[PDB]
């Protein structure tokens, strides 16, 4: 049975070169973002100035009745406000070394892109602020195109039809984005599965943990060994439990990437 050190050695040797990564809230709580709660600036602004129940912010009928609470969230989360942490920059290094096949994220914070991972390596399964769509005519827009409006508290409008333009966040009851169907080709192709800051207990992600081939190691860096990896373990599974930040930092040191990480972060926080 494999250790965290064993997985790092596979990566160093390039024996695993087609890494599929699945990430959740656990990697973004350290940047200061909540899992999608009294006491924060955000909550003082929405959950008090005007939401009726927390979930309404992600419901379409509410949205069309009153888009302001949702846009308060967009303004708080739009790229630039929060910083990627070591977990995101680990995945950035993985990509820059040619080892990342795809990163599947449950998060909407956008920090994978802010860390510099290109859109084509990402599957933002719960959607993104990086793009937006007219709710009436379906015209797509880059997220930059509505940024002035979002930062100024204006509800963005389509210049063709004047419909409300909504960031491409997945709302209750909507289908997952089309890119999610990359799983069909990605999972068979993976030669390593890394799962960070979630246990993927909820479908369709749960089932995806079993879509890699039987010889593929699955590394869970998560608070606990729970979920599908716990219910149906495989002989090449590895669990690094406790703090996901320490976990990643540990893996980065075993990889020998600690100094390169320090240089990346210093360049990157220079530019932001
Ligand atoms: C088909 C999967 C939908 C994914 C999804 O769309 C959302 C829209 C707004 C807010 C959240 C989501 C969201 C999820 O994050 C999500 C979806 C489901 I369905 C979901 O199910 C709850 C699981 N449930 C049964 C075990 C409680 C244990 C959970 I938790 C999160
Ligand atoms: Zn339109």
Swiss-Prot record:
<comment type="similarity">
    <text>Belongs to the sirtuin family. Class I subfamily.</text>
</comment>
<dbReference type="GO" id="GO:2000304">
    <property type="term" value="P:positive regulation of ceramide biosynthetic process"/>
</dbReference>
<keyword id="KW-0808">Transferase</keyword>
<feature type="binding site">
    <location>
        <begin position="106"/>
        <end position="109"/>
    </location>
    <ligand>
        <name>NAD(+)</name>
    </ligand>
</feature>
<feature type="modified residue" description="N6-succinyllysine">
    <location>
        <position position="1"/>
    </location>
</feature>
<dbReference type="GO" id="GO:0005759">
    <property type="term" value="C:mitochondrial matrix"/>
</dbReference>
<dbReference type="GO" id="GO:0009060">
    <property type="term" value="P:aerobic respiration"/>
</dbReference>
<feature type="binding site">
    <location>
        <position position="134"/>
    </location>
    <ligand>
        <name>Zn(2+)</name>
    </ligand>
</feature>
<keyword id="KW-0479">Metal-binding</keyword>
<feature type="binding site">
    <location>
        <position position="158"/>
    </location>
    <ligand>
        <name>Zn(2+)</name>
    </ligand>
</feature>
<feature type="binding site">
    <location>
        <begin position="197"/>
        <end position="199"/>
    </location>
    <ligand>
        <name>NAD(+)</name>
    </ligand>
</feature>
<dbReference type="GO" id="GO:0070373">
    <property type="term" value="P:negative regulation of ERK1 and ERK2 cascade"/>
</dbReference>
<keyword id="KW-0862">Zinc</keyword>
<dbReference type="GO" id="GO:0070403">
    <property type="term" value="F:NAD+ binding"/>
</dbReference>
<keyword id="KW-0520">NAD</keyword>
<feature type="binding site">
    <location>
        <position position="161"/>
    </location>
    <ligand>
        <name>Zn(2+)</name>
    </ligand>
</feature>
<feature type="binding site">
    <location>
        <position position="137"/>
    </location>
    <ligand>
        <name>Zn(2+)</name>
    </ligand>
</feature>
<dbReference type="GO" id="GO:1902553">
    <property type="term" value="P:positive regulation of catalase activity"/>
</dbReference>
<dbReference type="GO" id="GO:0043565">
    <property type="term" value="F:sequence-specific DNA binding"/>
</dbReference>
<comment type="function">
    <text>NAD-dependent protein deacetylase. Activates or deactivates mitochondrial target proteins by deacetylating key lysine residues. Known targets include ACSS1, IDH, GDH, SOD2, PDHA1, LCAD, SDHA, MRPL12 and the ATP synthase subunit ATP5PO. Contributes to the regulation of the cellular energy metabolism. Important for regulating tissue-specific ATP levels. In response to metabolic stress, deacetylates transcription factor FOXO3 and recruits FOXO3 and mitochondrial RNA polymerase POLRMT to mtDNA to promote mtDNA transcription.</text>
</comment>
<feature type="binding site">
    <location>
        <begin position="222"/>
        <end position="224"/>
    </location>
    <ligand>
        <name>NAD(+)</name>
    </ligand>
</feature>
<protein>
    <recommendedName>
        <fullName>NAD-dependent protein deacetylase sirtuin-3, mitochondrial</fullName>
        <ecNumber>2.3.1.286</ecNumber>
        <ecNumber>2.3.1.-</ecNumber>
    </recommendedName>
</protein>
<dbReference type="GO" id="GO:0033558">
    <property type="term" value="F:protein lysine deacetylase activity"/>
</dbReference>
<dbReference type="GO" id="GO:0034979">
    <property type="term" value="F:NAD-dependent protein lysine deacetylase activity"/>
</dbReference>
<dbReference type="GO" id="GO:1901671">
    <property type="term" value="P:positive regulation of superoxide dismutase activity"/>
</dbReference>
<dbReference type="GO" id="GO:0019899">
    <property type="term" value="F:enzyme binding"/>
</dbReference>
<keyword id="KW-0496">Mitochondrion</keyword>
<dbReference type="GO" id="GO:0005739">
    <property type="term" value="C:mitochondrion"/>
</dbReference>
<feature type="binding site">
    <location>
        <begin position="24"/>
        <end position="43"/>
    </location>
    <ligand>
        <name>NAD(+)</name>
    </ligand>
</feature>
<comment type="subunit">
    <text>Upon metabolic stress, forms a complex composed of FOXO3, SIRT3 and mitochondrial RNA polymerase POLRMT; the complex is recruited to mtDNA in a SIRT3-dependent manner. Also forms a complex composed of FOXO3, SIRT3, TFAM and POLRMT. Interacts with NDUFA9, ACSS1, IDH2 and GDH. Interacts with PCCA.</text>
</comment>
<dbReference type="GO" id="GO:0032991">
    <property type="term" value="C:protein-containing complex"/>
</dbReference>
<dbReference type="GO" id="GO:0008270">
    <property type="term" value="F:zinc ion binding"/>
</dbReference>
<dbReference type="GO" id="GO:0032024">
    <property type="term" value="P:positive regulation of insulin secretion"/>
</dbReference>
<keyword id="KW-0809">Transit peptide</keyword>
<dbReference type="GO" id="GO:0033554">
    <property type="term" value="P:cellular response to stress"/>
</dbReference>
<dbReference type="GO" id="GO:0006476">
    <property type="term" value="P:protein deacetylation"/>
</dbReference>
<feature type="domain" description="Deacetylase sirtuin-type">
    <location>
        <begin position="1"/>
        <end position="258"/>
    </location>
</feature>
<feature type="active site" description="Proton acceptor">
    <location>
        <position position="126"/>
    </location>
</feature>
<dbReference type="GO" id="GO:0005634">
    <property type="term" value="C:nucleus"/>
</dbReference>
<dbReference type="GO" id="GO:0034983">
    <property type="term" value="P:peptidyl-lysine deacetylation"/>
</dbReference>
<dbReference type="GO" id="GO:0017136">
    <property type="term" value="F:histone deacetylase activity, NAD-dependent"/>
</dbReference>
<dbReference type="GO" id="GO:0141208">
    <property type="term" value="F:NAD-dependent protein lysine delactylase activity"/>
</dbReference>
């Amino acid at each position: 049975k494999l250790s965290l050190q064993d997985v790092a050695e596979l990566i160093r040797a390039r024996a695993c070169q087609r890494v599929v990564v699945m990430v959740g809230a656990g990697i973004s709580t350290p940047s200061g973002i909540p899992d999608f709660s009294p006491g924060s600036g955000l909550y003082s602004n929405l959950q008090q100035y005007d939401l009726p129940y927390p979930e309404a912010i992600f419901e379409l009928p509410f949205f069309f009745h009153n888009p302001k609470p949702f846009f308060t969230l967009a303004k708080e989360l739009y790229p630039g406000n929060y910083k990627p942490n070591v977990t995101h920059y680990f995945l950035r290094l993985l990509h820059d070394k040619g080892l990342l096949l795809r990163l599947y994220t449950q998060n909407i914070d956008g920090l994978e892109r802010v860390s510099g991972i290109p859109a084509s390596k990402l599957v933002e399964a719960h959607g993104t602020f990086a793009s937006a769509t007219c709710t009436v005519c379906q015209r797509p827009f880059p997220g930059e195109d509505i940024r002035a409006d979002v930062m100024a508290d204006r509800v963005p409008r389509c210049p063709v039809c004047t419909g409300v333009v909504k960031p491409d966040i997945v709302f209750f009851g909507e289908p997952l984005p089309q890119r999610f169907l990359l799983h069909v080709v990605d999972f068979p192709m993976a030669d390593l599965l890394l799962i960070l800051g979630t246990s993927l207990e909820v479908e369709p992600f749960a089932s995806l943990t079993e879509a890699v081939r039987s010889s593929v190691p699955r590394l869970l860096i998560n608070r606990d060994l729970v979920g599908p990896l716990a219910w149906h373990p495989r002989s090449r599974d590895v669990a690094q439990l406790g703090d996901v930040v320490h976990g990643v930092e540990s893996l980065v040191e075993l990889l020998g990437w600690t100094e390169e990480m320090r240089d990346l972060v210093q360049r990157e926080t220079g530019k932001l």
